Every structure is written in C-alpha cells, then in structure tokens.
C-alpha cells in the first residue's frame with residue numbers, strides 16, 4: 008500500500024534541468040526482470056508508466072546481491088541527485104549511548120522499504136523517469152516514473168524522516184510514555200513496561216503505522232536483545248562495543264597501525280585506560296601505506312599493555328537525570344591523561360582520554376585544564392550538564408597556576424583528591440633581579456649554513472666559558488647557552504639572554520618534552536632554588552650582549 | 566493577527582547562497598527555555614515550524630537578559646547579515662553620526678520588540694532557518710522559520726527605518742542636539758545634558774516611543790534603589806591612551822634600565838621618533854642586575870624627551886572605513902585587562918583598560934566576555950561598528966561560556982590568540 012501523507016515539494020537546483028542520462032541497454036535477459044519487477048511496482052502503485060511528454064531519463068540496472076532468492080532492482084539517479092536541491096541534514100549527529108537512559112523493555116522495527124511507501128511530490132516524478140528497452144532492437148523503450156521516494160534519491164531520506172517524524176506524532180501524543188527514535192529505515196521503541204505490557208503498546212503502534220501503509224513484518228515485535236548500533240552493542244540497561252580485536256602479526260605495515268589506533272580509540276570510551284601515544288606517534292610518516300612500520304619496543308609495550316586490558320571485557324551503564332554526573336581524572340603517563348564519568352560509585356558510564364595537543368612544549372596543569380574542558384564539552388553534548396569534577400591536584404597549585412597564565416580559563420566545581428600522579432608546579436622562576444647572584448650574560452649563536460655554533464657567556468665576575476657545537480641553530484645554542492648557565496651557576500642565579508625564543512619557552516614553565524636540550528634546563532631549574540631569568544635585545548648594542556656576541560669571532564667573522 | 570503591512574521585497578547579495586551554520590549544543594536548561602520561547606512565537610505566528618525542503622540554518626542561544634531575568638532567545642545572525650545585509654547596506658544604508666562620541670552621555674535602548682510586526686517577503690524567510698537542539702542528537706531538533714522581522718537580522722532595522730524615523734522625528738523636533746542612533750535594535754541617544762535632565766529626558770522618549778507603536782523599552786530604574794547596573798549611560802567624552810607611562814625609577818638599576826630599554830625598543834614601533842641608543846650605552850656593562858647606574862647626563866636627556874614623546878601622539882589616526890577595525894585583549898593582573906583597536910599594527914585609533922578586581926566574580930571568562938562587549942560599544946559609539954576581537958583564551962573554553970554572562974544583542978566576529986604577550990607591560 009502507501010501513505011496518504013501530505014507530500015513534500017522538491018525543486019531542482021536553480022537554473023538546472025533533469026538528467027538526459029540514457030543507459031547502455033543491459034542484457035535483454037535481465038530486462039524481462041526489470042519489466043516484471045516494475046509491473047508489480049507499478050501495480051503496487053509505486054510507478055506510473057508514461058513515456059511521451061517526458062524527456063528525462065535515468066539508467067535501470069538489475070542483478071542479485073546478498074542472501075536473497077530473487078533478482079533485485081537498482082537505478083541510481085546520481086545525475087538527478089546532483090541537479091537536486093539541498094534538504095535538511097539527516098543526522099548531523101549520532102546520539103551517544105552513554106547519554107541514553109535505562110528502560111525495562113525496548114525493541115526495533117524495520118520500517119520495511121520505508122521510502123517506497125512514501126509519495127514523491129507529484130511533480131518531481133517526471134524527473135525520476137527511467138527506461139527499460141525490450142531486447143537489443145525490438146524495443147518500444149517502456150518508460151516509467153516514481154510516485155514514491157525512488158531508491159537512490161538525494162531527498163528520499165530527509166523527506167522520509169520528516170514524514171515518519173510526523174506519522175508517529177498523534178500516536179506518541181496519545182501514548183506519551185514510550186520514547187522513540189528512528190535510524191535509517193529502523194525504529195527504536197523502548198519503555199518501562201512489562202514485557203507483555205510492552206508488547207501491548209508495540210502492537211498498538213505497529214498497527215497505528217500500519218494504518219499509514221507502513222509495513223512492519225515484526226511478528227510479536229521481533230528483535231535481537233544484543234543491539235548492533237554504530238558499533239555499540241546495547242541492552243535496556245547497558246551498552247558496550249564487543250567486536251574489537253587488536254590483531255598481532257609480524258609484517259606490521261602502516262594501514263594496520265592506523266587500523267590498530269582506530270580500533271583502540273574506539274574502545275577507550277568504555278574501556279578505562281587504553282593508550283595509543285607511540286603507535287600514533289609512529290604513524291607520523293607520510294603517504295606510503297603499503298610499506299611496513301618498524302614498531303619499536305616503546306610501541307610493543309603499550310600494545311600488549313593495552314591488549315591485556317582489551318582481553319578482559321567491561322560494560323557501561325545508562326543515564327539517570329536524577330543524579331550528578333561526575334568527571335574524574337588522572338595522568339596515566341607522559342602526555343597522556345584519562346577520565347571517567349559516573350553517577351553512582353563504580354558503575355561505569357563513560358571513559359576516554361585527552362591526548363596532549365599541538366604546541367610541543369607545555370605544562371601539565373595547563374594540559375590538565377585543557378583536558379577538563381573536553382570533558383566539560385561532552386557532558387553538554389550528551390546529558391547537557393556540567394559534571395562535577397574530581398581532580399588529582401591541589402587548589403593552591405591550580406589557583407596560582409591560572410592566576411599566572413596569560414590566556415584565560417574556567418575551573419568548574421571541583422575537588423582535589425589524593426592519588427598517584429600529581430600535577431603541581433615543579434620549578435618556578437623569580438620576579439626581581441636576584442641580589443648577589445652571579446649575573447650570567449648568556450649567549451650563543453650559529454651559522455645556519457655551517458650548521459655549527461657556540462654556547463657560552465661571561466659572568467659578572469670576569470668569568471667566561473664557551474663550547475663549540477656541531478649541528479646547532481641560533482635557537483638550540485641559546486637554550487644550550489642557558490643550560491650551561493644553569494650547570495655552572497650556583498643555588499641562586501641571574502641568567503640573561505638575547506633569545507626571544509628561550510625567553511618565552513622557559514617563561515611558559517612547560518615540562519615533560521621531547522627536546523632533551525630543554526628537558527635538561529627544566530630538570531636544572533627543578534633542581535634549583537632561585538633563578539631570575541631576563542631578556543634583552545640581542546644586537547641592540549647592549550654591551551652585556553656586545554661581548555657575548557663579540558666572542559662569536561672564534562667561529563668566524565662578519 | 567489578520568492585519569499586516571506590505572513587504573519590502575528582500576533578496577540576498579547576488580551570487581551567494583543562504584547560510585548553513587551548525588547549531589552549537591546548549592544546555593538542557595537552555596533548550597527548555599528555547600522550547601518555551603519559540604513555541605509562544607509559533608503561537609503568535611512571528612515564527613513557524615518548517616520542513617526538509619529547507620537546508621539553511623543559523624545559530625541561536627538562550628540568554629538571561631537585563632540581570633539574570635527570565636531567558637531571552639538570541640540568533641547568531643552573523644552569516645546571513647553578511648550574506649545579505651552587506652550589499653543591502655548599499656541601499657538601506659542606516660547612517661552614522663560622528664559627533665555622538667563627542668556627546669557627554671549616551672544611553673542604549675533596545676528597540677527590538679518592534680520588528681515583530683512587519684512581515685517578511687515570503688521568499689526570504691527561507692533563510693531565517695534556525696534549529697533548536699535535541700539533547701544528545703536523540704530527536705531531529707525543532708526547526709522553525711521567521712514570519713516577521715528577526716531581531717538579529719541587520720536587514721530588519723534597515724527596513725524598520727521608515728516608521729522609526731517618524732517615531733522619533735517629533736521627539737527629535739523637540740530635542741535637536743539629542744542625537745539618536747540606530748544600530749540594529751538598540752538606540753543610542755546622546756546629549757551633554759546633566760544626569761537627571763538627560764535621565765528624565767530619556768524616559769520622556771521612552772514614553773513617547775511607547776505611545777507611537779507599542780515600542781516598549783526596558784524599565785532600568787524604578788523609584789527603587791538597588792545594586793543594579795548604573796545603566797548603559799556611557800560618557801564617551803572620556804577616552805584616552807594615557808597610561809603607558811615610563812616607570813619613575815629614581816633607583817635606576819642595570820636590570821631596570823634594561824627593562825626600560827626593552828619597552829622603549831618595541832615602543833619604537835608605535836612612535837618612530839623614539840631612539841633609545843645612548844641609554845643602551847648606560848647598560849653596556851656585564852654587571853650585577855641589581856646595580857644603580859643613573860649617570861649619563863646625555864642619556865637622561867633621552868629619558869625625559871621620549872618620556873613625554875608619549876603624550877604627543879602620532880599620525881596614527883586615519884579611520885579607514887573600508888578596512889576593518891581590530892580589537893585585541895591583554896589580561897593584565899587580577900581583574901586588570903586591556904585592549905587596543907586599530908586597523909593597522911601601530912595605527913591604533915584607540916586603546917584602553919578594563920578594571921574589575923577578580924574577587925566577587927573572578928571568572929576570567931566573565932570579565933573577558935564583559936570587556937569584549939564593553940569594547941564593542943566604543944567601537945559602535947565611534948565608528949558605529951563591531952571590531953574583530955583577538956581573544957587571549959581558548960576557542961573551546963570561550964566557545965562554552967560567553968553565552969553564560971553574555972548580555973548583549975549582537976555578536977561580533979572574534980578569534981583567539983594562543984600567542985602570548987611580549988606586549989605584556991604595565992600598559
């Protein structure tokens with residue numbers, strides 16, 4: 008049958024015209040099929056045979072694809088689809104399972120061939136015209152057109168969604184307490200009603216829709232308790248994704264690493280812990296995907312480390328708006344952090360992690376905060392709340408941290424908790440020039456062409472030093488230069504640099520980086536008691552620079 | 566209801582397509598408001614539910630107006646306007662009167678409830694497409710349209726100009742110097758009138774207004790005393806770039822002179838007349854930071870000279886109405902903040918500082934958000950336009966909170982600097 012629903016009008020893109028796409032007449036063999044299939048379709052009302060006053064054509068394909076025992080029909084109006092205007096975005100976003108709430112009974116109904124039942128705007132039909140020639144020559148070119156949403160049509164989905172969205176209305180109005188959601192041509196109806204009593208309404212609906220020519224072949228609401236949605240596997244009280252295998256082989260290539268990494272990130276949501284830093288850092292190579300990737304040891308560690316976790320299967324809970332969402336964090340390692348959102352003690356709702364972002368040298372706290380955000384962000388998108396945060400860090404620390412930073416932020420309601428990794432200010436510079444501390448007019452340089460430099464300085468106490476360097480930038484040398492300053496300096500020190508760079512860098516009070524050079528300086532500052540760094544214009548003619556720059560002659564002259 | 570007006574036949578700027586912005590997720594508490602708000606509008610036909618034949622969309626936000634009062638809907642009309650209102654501001658060009666900034670006190674009055682009458686060309690509402698979010702994308706989202714004149718839309722005030730004109734004309738005929746200025750749905754009326762004269766003179770208009778078209782305003786101050794805002798009664802005759810003073814370091818120190826020089830060095834870019842050289846000489850040593858070196862008679866002559874070279878500003882004043890104005894913020898100290906708007910790097914038309922000690926409310930974000938808007942005004946006030954804000958904050962952080970403290974009608978285009986300030990001085 009069909010649905011007497013108020014059709015939706017479609018206009019073709021402004022200044023455009025219907026497809027003149029003819030077809031390489033397919034094998035006269037599968038032509039009898041096309042005809043026989045469309046005769047019924049036409050007899051099912053879905054089609055109206057018309058050939059004269061209509062130029063517009065599209066190719067009619069036909070063969071058999073999956074487990075069926077019959078010939079299938081296909082016709083893609085890609086050409087038309089393009090000529091077609093734009094509608095509303097079907098699913099600009101997928102609902103996240105962790106956001107759902109618990110119900111006693113649920114179920115899913117295949118909305119049959121949803122689209123077909125739905126009527127094409129009376130006009131656009133001319134466009135959906137196609138051609139089924141008889142044989143190779145003996146042929147009248149029997150033309151037909153759709154009166155319903157065609158198999159491969161751009162609007163088809165949008166429309167249909169709208170349609171159904173409507174169709175349910177009165178019903179759902181009358182039967183207010185049974186939430187519904189549609190996905191593709193599928194219907195997810197759930198509620199807190201006694202299996203049979205759940206079955207009571209199911210039918211009521213099943214029937215309701217049936218009044219609209221919408222075919223649902225569910226016998227007594229036929230569904231597989233284990234739901235396979237967007238990878239998730241759901242149940243009226245718990246959700247999880249099961250098919251997740253981290254393959255192990257020898258000839259590890261790129262594509263595989265990526266796949267591993269995708270497969271890994273995916274499970275993280277639910278699996279508390281998963282790491283991917285190395286495996287990912289590795290993928291960093293460019294374009295060649297067919298090549299094999301040398302998973303170094305650091306990699307293997309996290310992999311089988313992860314593997315251990317993956318082996319053991321965990322599950323997640325649903326939402327109860329009558330409670331507080333809670334976000335708890337911890338630093339699982341260098342660069343990596345994790346979170347988990349729960350309502351009641353140890354009943355996992357959601358996990359995941361924030362991977363240290365761009366900006367090579369950062370501070371953990373800053374990072375931690377950068378982390379809290381992502382969390383903040385999700386809770387909104389899901390349960391539209393702000394989870395109260397559980398933060399492994401002191402308030403004095405935090406406080407002083409943000410009271411310091413240049414950029415601005417916002418710490419929600421959060422409590423400090425004692426746990427293993429602790430984010431805190433390791434080192435912390437001075438404010439005013441340290442009295443007595445030997446001043447260090449640190450300097451360095453390098454001839455980019457020569458790829459060689461020199462690091463050194465001259466302390467106020469007529470003291471000098473230098474160290475030549477192979478493979479160094481004016482930048483690297485500068486840090487290096489400060490690093491020396493650090494080594495040679497005492498407990499209290501005044502370091503002076505001409506580095507725009509290092510100036511900023513150290514001031515950023517970052518930590519845990521990949522630049523040994525820096526890591527060291529860091530570790531020294533850590534080791535220290537009172538450092539006062541300061542910055543001045545390299546060539547501006549300060550004599551404090553004049554000399555540290557005048558020593559540069561030992562490499563060359565200019 | 567059944568009684569309308571005609572429709573200025575509207576059209577987008579030729580060649581462009583309707584806006585298709587993505588609706589930011591908002592809180593449930595916000596959604597609920599918006600469900601309410603827009604339903605009443607479905608009721609009062611000002612707006613209506615649409616279908617899939619429509620793909621456009623423009624952002625919306627819930628906001629507690631005039632001091633956390635019950636909620637207010639806000640469409641982020643930024644794009645559409647830019648897609649219509651621009652070549653449109655070549656026709657209905659609402660004028661900008663310079664001298665206002667010169668006036669002593671100006672107030673703002675939202676003249677938006679007005680537009681909600683005049684219908685819209687049936688072929689343009691198409692663009693008024695706005696969606697309200699279904700938490701966690703569980704539902705398909707409520708999609709409405711606009712039937713009358715949309716508050717955020719820049720094409721609407723332009724239209725309304727007609728009535729507005731006469732609405733005021735008489736009030737203007739009784740009050741001439743009282744300059745009034747319309748920017749979207751806000752009224753800025755300036756005078757050099759004493760506080761209360763101005764004040765009363767204000768409600769005067771408010772009432773007159775109301776009389777002429779149920780153009781109802783906001784009752785900002787009853788006979789009641791409260792700790793509420795001292796109104797949007799700015800005093801633009803007050804604006805300076807003064808505080809960028811050289812520290813008066815009687816105790817000059819190697820460190821200090823250096824610092825000194827440093828500021829002076831970058832400061833050289835904002836005053837190509839300053840030369841610090843002879844001073845640079847005073848610190849040419851490799852001494853102890855904390856050491857006193859005033860001496861150079863020839864140098865302090867430089868201290869003083871440039872020390873005042875500040876007070877006598879440069880050429881940097883050529884408001885290029887073609888170019889866009891750029892705002893830039895500096896988080897100074899506890900509740901200390903700063904900005905500067907220029908169209909060109911050191912051609913900064915005006916700079917200023919925002920102060921509101923982080924304590925009773927230290928939410929940077931809030932103060933930032935506050936500031937922004939407070940800057941926004943100036944700009945409008947003066948050139949009658951919204952700058953481009955360079956926000957010293959995270960996109961994502963900001964993209965999750967301005968909408969909380971944000972109590973303005975319009976929303977300026979902004980961006981975020983992950984670039985710290987060497988510029989960070991006392992200025």
Ligand SMILES: CC(C)=CCN1Cc2c(Cl)ccc3[nH]c(=S)n(c23)C[C@@H]1C
Nearest residue numbers: 107108186187188190195196197241242
């Ligand atoms: C994710 C999809 C298609 C959800 C549809 N879905 C069914 C469902 C399932 Cl399968 C598990 C827990 C669920 N929690 C909620 S609420 N629902 C729910 C209702 C909607 C009706």
